[PDB]
Amino acid sequence: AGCLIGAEYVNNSYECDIPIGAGICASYQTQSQSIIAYT
Amino acid sequence: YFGGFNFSQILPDPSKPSKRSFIEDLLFNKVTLADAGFIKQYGDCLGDI
Ligand SMILES: *[C@@H]1O[C@H](CO)[C@@H](O)[C@H](O)[C@H]1NC(C)=O
């Protein structure tokens, strides 16, 4: 759905918090406080 | 083995990467999509062909 700027992609899988696009979600996780993107 | 019942056309097969069954493959091939911009298309739209 375009490209994301400001969130680091991780190789994990949790429940969807903030929906972005085709199967990608974003969340605010502790592992320093930062925004991550995941499937 | 499920008592003789044949579920091989509705259960998925790992041969194809999009793990869909035979009936699902027929249903997905039958409906001709309009090819909307749910995939990015501006690189195609830039090159006039
Ligand atoms: C029915 O089951 C057999 C296995 O006993 C399988 O070889 C066959 O392909 C199945 N039928 C269809 C149409 O897939």
Swiss-Prot record, chain B:
Glycosylation positions in this chain: N6
Region (Fusion peptide 1): 21-42
Disordered as annotated region, ranges: 33-49
Record-annotated site: Cleavage: R20, S21
Superkingdom of origin organism: Viruses
Reported function: Precursor of the fusion protein processed in the biosynthesis of the S protein and the formation of virus particle. Mediates fusion of the virion and cellular membranes by functioning as a class I viral fusion protein. Contains two viral fusion peptides that are unmasked after cleavage. The S2/S2' cleavage occurs during virus entry at the cell membrane by host TMPRSS2 or during endocytosis by host CSTL.
Protein name stated in the entry: Spike protein S2
Organism: Severe acute respiratory syndrome coronavirus 2
Residues of the full protein shown: 796 to 844 of 1273
